[PDB]
Design a protein around this ligand. Structure first.
Ligand code: MCI
Ligand code: ZN
Ligand code: ZN
Length: 216
């Protein structure tokens, strides 16, 4: 329904939000971020379509920022929908080796650059990628911004419900959420993909929801 919106969240950090009607769920927002590092912009999750990705990129370009790259938190289209367009514009794209393999298995275009491991610095000491383990999907990773203490949790952060479990790993999620909460209790802001920004308590709520889902 509403168009893509881009609003400031904190210094050098913007939240981009698109909306989608999802069968069985109603209107659902999709939040991603744009992080600025000295005159350059990094996309944390791409929008869902090539046209929303062009819009997002153009909004920062028109303000003098060069798009240095994008990182997708997991393989579903709401995080990677923009990789094809970014690659066509020769803008560096990034995703974990697991994410690219899922994209490949899925007949989707892959990120141009990959990484693996528990932690990976997209930008040394400024934009870190952390893999807590399987949860919402097998490959989901989060993005941490040290200065502002902002954690982009993506589709892993599910404080009020787990959402679509089609590619989830219900067995592993609680372990994954425990590790994530231990790691980022220091977060001032946690930005979920599908719900409002919150504080570190969202890590606890996600652990609870995951625990709850393993039972039933
Ligand atoms: O599981 C999910 O993360 C998500 N579903 C999807 O399949 C999503 C990819 S992860 C595709 C739909 C989509 C695409 C663009 C923008 C918003 C939603 C959600 C469905 C409904 C949600 C709301 N909420 C979560 N737990 N209870 N309800 S989140
Ligand atoms: Zn997903
Ligand atoms: Zn999602």
């Amino acid at each position: 329904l509403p168009d893509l919106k881009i609003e400031k969240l904190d210094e050098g950090v913007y939240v981009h939000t698109s909306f989608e009607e999802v069968n069985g769920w109603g209107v659902v927002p999709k939040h991603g971020l744009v992080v600025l590092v000295n005159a350059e912009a990094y996309l944390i999750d791409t929008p869902f379509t090539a046209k929303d990705t062009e819009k997002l990129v153009t909004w920062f370009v028109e303000r003098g920022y060069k798009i240095k790259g994008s990182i997708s938190s997991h393989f579903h289209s709401d995080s990677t929908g923009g990789i094809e367009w970014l690659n066509s514009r020769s803008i560096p794209t990034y995703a974990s080796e697991l994410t690219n393999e899922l994209l490949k298995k899925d007949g989707k275009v892959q990120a141009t650059n990959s990484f693996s491991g528990v932690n990976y610095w997209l930008v040394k000491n400024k934009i870190e990628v952390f893999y807590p383990g399987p949860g919402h999907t097998p490959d989901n990773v989060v993005v941490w911004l040290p200065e502002r203490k902002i954690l982009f949790g993506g589709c892993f952060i599910k404080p009020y419900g787990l959402g679509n479990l089609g590619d989830a790993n219900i067995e592993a999620w609680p372990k994954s959420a425990k590790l994530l909460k231990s790691k980022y209790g220091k977060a001032k802001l946690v930005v979920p993909s599908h719900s409002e920004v919150g504080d570190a308590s969202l890590l606890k709520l996600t652990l609870e929801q995951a625990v709850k889902g393993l039972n039933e």
